[PDB]
PDB file of C-alpha atoms and ligand atoms in Angstrom:
ATOM      1  CA  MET A   1      29.998  25.134  -7.503  1.00 30.35           C
ATOM      2  CA  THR A   2      25.741  25.103  -6.655  1.00 26.05           C
ATOM      3  CA  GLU A   3      23.927  26.783  -3.151  1.00 25.69           C
ATOM      4  CA  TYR A   4      21.544  26.002  -1.154  1.00 23.24           C
ATOM      5  CA  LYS A   5      19.881  28.427   0.819  1.00 23.77           C
ATOM      6  CA  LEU A   6      18.606  26.104   4.172  1.00 26.33           C
ATOM      7  CA  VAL A   7      16.570  28.240   6.665  1.00 24.19           C
ATOM      8  CA  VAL A   8      15.106  25.686  10.179  1.00 24.52           C
ATOM      9  CA  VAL A   9      12.339  27.484  11.268  1.00 23.09           C
ATOM     10  CA  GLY A  10       9.821  25.917  14.271  1.00 23.39           C
ATOM     11  CA  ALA A  11       8.957  27.306  17.748  1.00 23.58           C
ATOM     12  CA  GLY A  12      11.571  27.524  20.844  1.00 22.40           C
ATOM     13  CA  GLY A  13      13.374  24.828  21.836  1.00 19.75           C
ATOM     14  CA  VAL A  14      12.517  22.219  19.380  1.00 18.86           C
ATOM     15  CA  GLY A  15      16.066  21.426  18.605  1.00 19.08           C
ATOM     16  CA  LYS A  16      16.529  23.882  15.782  1.00 17.45           C
ATOM     17  CA  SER A  17      19.849  24.898  16.988  1.00 19.39           C
ATOM     18  CA  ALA A  18      21.172  21.542  17.722  1.00 19.99           C
ATOM     19  CA  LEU A  19      20.300  20.130  14.685  1.00 20.29           C
ATOM     20  CA  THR A  20      22.343  22.684  12.531  1.00 23.60           C
ATOM     21  CA  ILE A  21      25.501  21.955  14.696  1.00 21.66           C
ATOM     22  CA  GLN A  22      25.142  17.926  14.521  1.00 21.58           C
ATOM     23  CA  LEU A  23      25.249  18.910  10.920  1.00 21.88           C
ATOM     24  CA  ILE A  24      27.939  21.519  10.732  1.00 22.21           C
ATOM     25  CA  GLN A  25      29.857  20.839  13.940  1.00 24.97           C
ATOM     26  CA  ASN A  26      29.319  17.417  14.660  1.00 25.71           C
ATOM     27  CA  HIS A  27      27.998  17.617  18.349  1.00 24.59           C
ATOM     28  CA  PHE A  28      25.137  17.767  19.618  1.00 23.80           C
ATOM     29  CA  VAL A  29      24.576  20.904  22.122  1.00 20.21           C
ATOM     30  CA  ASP A  30      23.306  20.238  25.346  1.00 20.52           C
ATOM     31  CA  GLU A  31      22.462  23.339  27.045  1.00 17.24           C
ATOM     32  CA  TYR A  32      19.880  25.634  25.906  1.00 20.72           C
ATOM     33  CA  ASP A  33      20.694  28.880  24.240  1.00 17.20           C
ATOM     34  CA  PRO A  34      18.031  30.580  22.402  1.00 19.51           C
ATOM     35  CA  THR A  35      18.519  31.869  19.037  1.00 20.09           C
ATOM     36  CA  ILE A  36      18.522  34.826  17.820  1.00 18.30           C
ATOM     37  CA  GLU A  37      20.001  34.662  13.795  1.00 20.41           C
ATOM     38  CA  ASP A  38      22.942  32.224  13.249  1.00 20.00           C
ATOM     39  CA  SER A  39      24.657  31.728  10.136  1.00 23.30           C
ATOM     40  CA  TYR A  40      26.312  28.318   8.817  1.00 23.15           C
ATOM     41  CA  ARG A  41      28.097  27.727   5.432  1.00 28.01           C
ATOM     42  CA  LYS A  42      29.771  24.817   4.699  1.00 24.52           C
ATOM     43  CA  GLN A  43      31.127  22.412   1.592  1.00 22.72           C
ATOM     44  CA  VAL A  44      29.890  18.797   1.385  1.00 23.74           C
ATOM     45  CA  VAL A  45      29.374  16.237  -1.695  1.00 19.61           C
ATOM     46  CA  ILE A  46      25.252  15.626  -2.373  1.00 16.81           C
ATOM     47  CA  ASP A  47      24.848  12.770  -4.242  1.00 16.31           C
ATOM     48  CA  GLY A  48      27.366  13.511  -6.239  1.00 17.89           C
ATOM     49  CA  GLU A  49      27.881  17.238  -6.801  1.00 16.63           C
ATOM     50  CA  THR A  50      29.781  19.406  -4.616  1.00 17.50           C
ATOM     51  CA  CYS A  51      27.704  21.955  -3.172  1.00 14.88           C
ATOM     52  CA  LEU A  52      27.894  24.948  -0.610  1.00 13.99           C
ATOM     53  CA  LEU A  53      25.570  25.065   2.501  1.00 13.18           C
ATOM     54  CA  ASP A  54      24.050  27.925   3.160  1.00 13.48           C
ATOM     55  CA  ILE A  55      21.892  27.210   6.534  1.00 11.40           C
ATOM     56  CA  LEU A  56      20.415  29.886   8.077  1.00 10.69           C
ATOM     57  CA  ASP A  57      19.329  28.968  12.055  1.00  8.77           C
ATOM     58  CA  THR A  58      16.201  31.175  13.386  1.00  9.41           C
ATOM     59  CA  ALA A  59      14.079  32.753  16.221  1.00  7.40           C
ATOM     60  CA  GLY A  60      10.964  30.486  17.828  1.00  6.99           C
ATOM     61  CA  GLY A  61       8.103  31.174  18.227  1.00  8.63           C
ATOM     62  CA  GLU A  62       5.271  34.070  17.138  1.00 10.75           C
ATOM     63  CA  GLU A  63       7.128  37.013  19.310  1.00 15.67           C
ATOM     64  CA  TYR A  64       9.942  36.557  16.658  1.00 17.29           C
ATOM     65  CA  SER A  65       7.849  36.855  13.665  1.00 18.73           C
ATOM     66  CA  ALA A  66       8.264  40.501  12.417  1.00 21.11           C
ATOM     67  CA  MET A  67      12.484  40.055  12.632  1.00 23.69           C
ATOM     68  CA  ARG A  68      12.218  36.803  10.546  1.00 23.68           C
ATOM     69  CA  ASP A  69      10.216  37.931   7.730  1.00 22.48           C
ATOM     70  CA  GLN A  70      13.637  39.285   6.398  1.00 22.18           C
ATOM     71  CA  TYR A  71      15.937  37.317   6.817  1.00 23.78           C
ATOM     72  CA  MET A  72      13.628  34.467   5.643  1.00 26.81           C
ATOM     73  CA  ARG A  73      12.811  36.568   1.735  1.00 27.40           C
ATOM     74  CA  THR A  74      16.181  34.503   0.474  1.00 27.93           C
ATOM     75  CA  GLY A  75      15.614  31.226   1.774  1.00 28.44           C
ATOM     76  CA  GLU A  76      15.899  28.458  -1.259  1.00 28.65           C
ATOM     77  CA  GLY A  77      14.508  25.677   1.293  1.00 27.57           C
ATOM     78  CA  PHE A  78      12.655  25.502   4.646  1.00 27.46           C
ATOM     79  CA  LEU A  79      12.668  22.031   7.375  1.00 25.62           C
ATOM     80  CA  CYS A  80       9.987  22.813   9.504  1.00 25.16           C
ATOM     81  CA  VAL A  81      11.194  21.792  13.018  1.00 24.36           C
ATOM     82  CA  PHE A  82       8.635  20.392  16.120  1.00 24.89           C
ATOM     83  CA  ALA A  83       9.866  18.170  18.746  1.00 27.17           C
ATOM     84  CA  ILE A  84       7.844  14.528  19.511  1.00 29.82           C
ATOM     85  CA  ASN A  85       6.847  15.419  23.327  1.00 30.72           C
ATOM     86  CA  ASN A  86       5.926  19.510  22.279  1.00 29.36           C
ATOM     87  CA  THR A  87       2.257  18.695  21.125  1.00 28.95           C
ATOM     88  CA  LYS A  88       2.192  22.863  20.653  1.00 29.65           C
ATOM     89  CA  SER A  89       5.281  23.111  18.685  1.00 28.49           C
ATOM     90  CA  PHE A  90       3.229  20.399  16.663  1.00 32.45           C
ATOM     91  CA  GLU A  91       0.454  22.345  16.535  1.00 31.95           C
ATOM     92  CA  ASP A  92       2.394  25.560  15.921  1.00 28.94           C
ATOM     93  CA  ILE A  93       3.411  23.791  12.390  1.00 34.57           C
ATOM     94  CA  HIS A  94       1.175  25.553  10.367  1.00 38.33           C
ATOM     95  CA  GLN A  95       1.684  29.062  11.452  1.00 38.83           C
ATOM     96  CA  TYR A  96       5.494  28.791  10.138  1.00 37.37           C
ATOM     97  CA  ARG A  97       4.359  27.448   7.331  1.00 37.81           C
ATOM     98  CA  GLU A  98       1.648  30.373   6.082  1.00 37.68           C
ATOM     99  CA  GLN A  99       4.709  32.653   7.298  1.00 34.59           C
ATOM    100  CA  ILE A 100       6.481  30.653   4.370  1.00 34.35           C
ATOM    101  CA  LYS A 101       4.621  31.398   2.191  1.00 34.57           C
ATOM    102  CA  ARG A 102       4.391  34.972   3.212  1.00 34.81           C
ATOM    103  CA  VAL A 103       7.632  35.818   2.799  1.00 34.34           C
ATOM    104  CA  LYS A 104       8.319  33.648  -0.366  1.00 33.99           C
ATOM    105  CA  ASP A 105       4.740  34.828  -1.972  1.00 36.98           C
ATOM    106  CA  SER A 106       3.790  30.939  -3.269  1.00 42.51           C
ATOM    107  CA  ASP A 107       2.590  28.506  -2.402  1.00 40.40           C
ATOM    108  CA  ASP A 108       4.993  25.674  -3.928  1.00 39.56           C
ATOM    109  CA  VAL A 109       8.064  26.006  -1.696  1.00 43.12           C
ATOM    110  CA  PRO A 110      10.897  23.037  -1.434  1.00 40.74           C
ATOM    111  CA  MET A 111       9.918  21.982   2.737  1.00 41.39           C
ATOM    112  CA  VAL A 112      10.736  18.987   4.789  1.00 41.28           C
ATOM    113  CA  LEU A 113       8.615  18.301   7.737  1.00 41.98           C
ATOM    114  CA  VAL A 114      11.124  17.943  10.760  1.00 43.41           C
ATOM    115  CA  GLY A 115       9.642  15.442  14.236  1.00 42.08           C
ATOM    116  CA  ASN A 116      12.907  16.272  16.416  1.00 38.78           C
ATOM    117  CA  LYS A 117      13.928  14.647  19.469  1.00 41.62           C
ATOM    118  CA  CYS A 118      13.059  11.311  18.367  1.00 41.95           C
ATOM    119  CA  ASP A 119      16.225   9.675  21.895  1.00 42.53           C
ATOM    120  CA  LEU A 120      12.868  10.649  24.089  1.00 43.91           C
ATOM    121  CA  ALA A 121      10.298   8.512  24.812  1.00 42.17           C
ATOM    122  CA  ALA A 122       7.704  10.972  25.877  1.00 44.23           C
ATOM    123  CA  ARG A 123       6.481  10.535  22.675  1.00 43.73           C
ATOM    124  CA  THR A 124       2.902  12.761  22.323  1.00 43.85           C
ATOM    125  CA  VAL A 125       2.904  13.243  18.298  1.00 44.78           C
ATOM    126  CA  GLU A 126       2.723   9.937  17.022  1.00 45.78           C
ATOM    127  CA  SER A 127       4.089   9.520  12.940  1.00 42.45           C
ATOM    128  CA  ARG A 128       1.073   9.121  11.577  1.00 40.12           C
ATOM    129  CA  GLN A 129      -0.331  12.459  12.699  1.00 39.33           C
ATOM    130  CA  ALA A 130       2.680  14.097  11.204  1.00 42.72           C
ATOM    131  CA  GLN A 131       2.916  11.893   7.919  1.00 43.13           C
ATOM    132  CA  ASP A 132      -0.459  13.228   7.957  1.00 44.96           C
ATOM    133  CA  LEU A 133       0.003  16.854   7.960  1.00 45.92           C
ATOM    134  CA  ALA A 134       2.719  16.610   5.451  1.00 47.63           C
ATOM    135  CA  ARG A 135       0.767  14.499   2.919  1.00 46.29           C
ATOM    136  CA  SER A 136      -1.675  17.486   3.048  1.00 49.70           C
ATOM    137  CA  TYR A 137       1.122  19.903   2.445  1.00 46.82           C
ATOM    138  CA  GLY A 138       3.011  16.841  -0.154  1.00 47.18           C
ATOM    139  CA  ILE A 139       6.118  17.023   1.824  1.00 50.21           C
ATOM    140  CA  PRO A 140       7.569  14.796   3.584  1.00 48.13           C
ATOM    141  CA  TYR A 141       8.442  13.444   6.961  1.00 45.43           C
ATOM    142  CA  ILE A 142      11.619  12.725   8.455  1.00 44.56           C
ATOM    143  CA  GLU A 143      12.462  12.219  12.544  1.00 44.60           C
ATOM    144  CA  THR A 144      15.292  12.948  13.556  1.00 42.60           C
ATOM    145  CA  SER A 145      17.040  13.460  16.761  1.00 44.65           C
ATOM    146  CA  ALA A 146      20.178  15.767  17.083  1.00 40.40           C
ATOM    147  CA  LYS A 147      21.761  13.991  20.063  1.00 40.44           C
ATOM    148  CA  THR A 148      22.411  10.323  18.481  1.00 38.88           C
ATOM    149  CA  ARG A 149      22.159  11.882  14.813  1.00 38.22           C
ATOM    150  CA  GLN A 150      19.423   9.495  13.757  1.00 35.47           C
ATOM    151  CA  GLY A 151      17.718  11.188  10.382  1.00 34.40           C
ATOM    152  CA  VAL A 152      20.394  13.979  10.596  1.00 35.03           C
ATOM    153  CA  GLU A 153      21.855  14.012   7.902  1.00 38.76           C
ATOM    154  CA  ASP A 154      18.309  12.845   6.039  1.00 37.08           C
ATOM    155  CA  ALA A 155      15.988  15.750   6.860  1.00 38.62           C
ATOM    156  CA  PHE A 156      18.755  18.230   5.528  1.00 38.34           C
ATOM    157  CA  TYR A 157      19.671  16.371   2.108  1.00 41.86           C
ATOM    158  CA  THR A 158      16.031  15.736   1.456  1.00 41.48           C
ATOM    159  CA  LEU A 159      15.275  19.714   1.820  1.00 41.83           C
ATOM    160  CA  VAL A 160      18.577  19.613  -0.707  1.00 43.89           C
ATOM    161  CA  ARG A 161      16.525  17.259  -2.975  1.00 46.90           C
ATOM    162  CA  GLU A 162      13.688  18.830  -3.002  1.00 47.99           C
ATOM    163  CA  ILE A 163      15.111  21.717  -3.183  1.00 46.70           C
ATOM    164  CA  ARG A 164      16.572  19.976  -6.894  1.00 42.37           C
ATOM    165  CA  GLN A 165      12.352  19.031  -7.894  1.00 48.28           C
ATOM    166  CA  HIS A 166      11.337  22.665  -7.449  1.00 43.16           C
TER     167      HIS A 166
HETATM  168  N1  LIG B   1      17.020  14.502  23.954  1.00 46.40           N
HETATM  169  C1  LIG B   1      16.871  15.901  23.174  1.00 46.40           C
HETATM  170  N2  LIG B   1      16.375  16.311  22.925  1.00 46.40           N
HETATM  171  C2  LIG B   1      17.305  17.752  21.983  1.00 46.40           C
HETATM  172  C3  LIG B   1      17.233  17.500  20.493  1.00 46.40           C
HETATM  173  N3  LIG B   1      17.482  18.278  20.139  1.00 46.40           N
HETATM  174  C4  LIG B   1      17.543  19.873  21.020  1.00 46.40           C
HETATM  175  N4  LIG B   1      17.323  19.227  21.773  1.00 46.40           N
HETATM  176  C5  LIG B   1      17.279  20.128  23.399  1.00 46.40           C
HETATM  177  O1  LIG B   1      16.825  21.132  23.603  1.00 46.40           O
HETATM  178  C6  LIG B   1      17.149  21.493  23.801  1.00 46.40           C
HETATM  179  C7  LIG B   1      16.625  23.262  23.243  1.00 46.40           C
HETATM  180  O2  LIG B   1      17.236  23.055  21.854  1.00 46.40           O
HETATM  181  P1  LIG B   1      18.023  24.675  21.169  1.00 46.40           P
HETATM  182  O3  LIG B   1      18.670  23.593  19.592  1.00 46.40           O
HETATM  183  O4  LIG B   1      18.122  24.919  21.923  1.00 46.40           O
HETATM  184  O5  LIG B   1      16.297  24.784  20.554  1.00 46.40           O
HETATM  185  P2  LIG B   1      16.094  25.792  19.199  1.00 46.40           P
HETATM  186  O6  LIG B   1      15.121  24.864  18.646  1.00 46.40           O
HETATM  187  O7  LIG B   1      17.467  26.381  18.357  1.00 46.40           O
HETATM  188  N5  LIG B   1      14.817  27.334  19.823  1.00 46.40           N
HETATM  189  P3  LIG B   1      15.748  28.766  19.377  1.00 46.40           P
HETATM  190  O8  LIG B   1      14.402  28.871  18.936  1.00 46.40           O
HETATM  191  O9  LIG B   1      15.042  29.542  21.107  1.00 46.40           O
HETATM  192  O10 LIG B   1      16.290  28.835  19.091  1.00 46.40           O
HETATM  193  C8  LIG B   1      18.331  22.126  24.362  1.00 46.40           C
HETATM  194  O11 LIG B   1      18.574  21.905  25.952  1.00 46.40           O
HETATM  195  C9  LIG B   1      19.401  21.246  23.608  1.00 46.40           C
HETATM  196  O12 LIG B   1      19.980  20.031  24.210  1.00 46.40           O
HETATM  197  C10 LIG B   1      17.351  16.000  20.529  1.00 46.40           C
HETATM  198  O13 LIG B   1      16.723  15.745  19.205  1.00 46.40           O
HETATM  199  N6  LIG B   1      16.940  15.019  21.642  1.00 46.40           N
HETATM  200 CA1  LIG B   2      27.657  19.054  24.176  1.00 47.92          CA
HETATM  201 CA1  LIG B   3       5.033  38.119   1.138  1.00 46.23          CA
HETATM  202 MG1  LIG B   4      18.257  27.945  18.548  1.00 45.21          MG
HETATM  203 MG1  LIG B   5      -2.444  12.450  20.991  1.00 47.59          MG
HETATM  204 MG1  LIG B   6       8.388  15.686  -5.639  1.00 49.65          MG
END
């Protein structure tokens, strides 16, 4: 069956792990344990196709950049995650995108921009601001909450649908 190798990137604390765990394991991780490099695999049906998702959950932050380079190399699509209550995380996105382009040696990599923590009310990144960034990259913008599950399947499945257009 078809395998989709997805990679989740973005600043520390934005919810990469919580998103992945919610998708794969159907619960919300409330605590914060920084990630080094974790993988999850699960068989799912997406648009009638039985397939295997292989999801790489990466370490966030400029300090782990070198480590990510090699682990990121076989990624077929990337979720670029910021949190809607963390302006710096949004400002950091372009650096993650640039890393992706470096590791894939391509300007045309399947990606989705994800604004996570949309259950929180202390919003400092407005939807339109993120829409505009995504538009510049030619990719979708989707908001998610790993806490409530809002948008979580949509984000990951949309990434699969972007891979399929490549
Ligand atoms: N309210 C709310 N909290 C969230 C959401 N997603 C993650 N969090 C919280 O934010 C914290 C960090 O989440 P985590 O997934 O560990 O972040 P990360 O991006 O994997 N960090 P790292 O790069 O260090 O591994 C946790 O306390 C988690 O519960 C969300 O959608 N809503
Ligand atoms: Ca929990
Ligand atoms: Ca390279
Ligand atoms: Mg993590
Ligand atoms: Mg503002
Ligand atoms: Mg398209």
